[PDB]
Amino acid sequence: FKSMTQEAFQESSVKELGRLEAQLASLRQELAALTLKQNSVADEVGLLPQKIQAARADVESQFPDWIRQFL
Amino acid sequence: FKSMTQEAFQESSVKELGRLEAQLASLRQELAALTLKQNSVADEVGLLPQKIQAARADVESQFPDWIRQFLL
Amino acid sequence: FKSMTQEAFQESSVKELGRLEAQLASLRQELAALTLKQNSVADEVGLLPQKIQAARADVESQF
Numbered sequence: 001f002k003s004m005t006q007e008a009f010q011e012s013s014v015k016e017l018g019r020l021e022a023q024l025a026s027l028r029q030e031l032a033a034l035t036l037k038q039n040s041v042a043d044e045v046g047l048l049p050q051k052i053q054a055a056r057a058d059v060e061s062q063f064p065d066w067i068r069q070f071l
Numbered sequence: 072f073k074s075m076t077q078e079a080f081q082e083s084s085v086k087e088l089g090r091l092e093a094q095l096a097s098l099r100q101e102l103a104a105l106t107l108k109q110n111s112v113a114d115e116v117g118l119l120p121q122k123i124q125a126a127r128a129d130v131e132s133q134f135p136d137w138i139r140q141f142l143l
Numbered sequence: 144f145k146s147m148t149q150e151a152f153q154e155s156s157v158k159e160l161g162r163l164e165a166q167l168a169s170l171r172q173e174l175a176a177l178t179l180k181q182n183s184v185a186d187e188v189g190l191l192p193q194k195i196q197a198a199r200a201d202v203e204s205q206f
Contacts, residue, residue, distance in 0.1 A: 003150040016160060017087055023167055024094045031101050034181060041185050042112055048191060052126050055199045059130055064141055081152055088159050095166045102173060109181055116184055127198045
């Protein structure tokens with residue numbers, strides 16, 4: 001193993017720690033961003049049953065008119 | 072007189088390694104939590120095609136009763 | 144006699160930073176895989192309203 005002077009190691013280790021710290025900050029923000037996308041998607045999913053019933057009810061209101069259009 | 076710089080830098084170094092190691096632990100835990108929530112929503116999304124088909128065919132099944140009433 | 148505290152402290156600190164850096168690489172790899180999975184689910188859910196409309200247009204057409 002090759003040691004550096006105290007001053008060189010002070011400079012190098014502090015810069016490498018700061019690099020890791022910046023990487024960690026970027027990762028934490030990614031995780032936050034992904035949580036936000038996740039909640040938005042869950043909100044959409046939660047609304048789907050309401051959307052199916054609207055169309056379901058919408059169809060059966062156009063029904064007598066569909067027999068009329070037919071003939 | 073005893074100089075203190077060298078020892079103090081050793082101390083602050085291991086403390087800062089520890090501070091970042093703790094951030095890593097928190098991030099890893101949050102990634103595990105996201106993973107669990109993603110699997111949960113994925114299972115739920117997996118039942119949605121069936122949900123639409125079940126509504127498509129159920130409408131399909133309420134025509135006889137409907138048309139008899141209309142012509143009545 | 145050669146003192147060794149400094150050189151042992153340097154070697155251990157470097158190695159420990161290496162251990163944390165490998166933890167980070169493992170997290171990035173896992174998050175990359177998860178991001179894709181989440182994007183795929185978001186894409187499918189985003190198209191579901193269109194599928195509902197297709198189902199109600201099919202009803203009207205099929206009879």
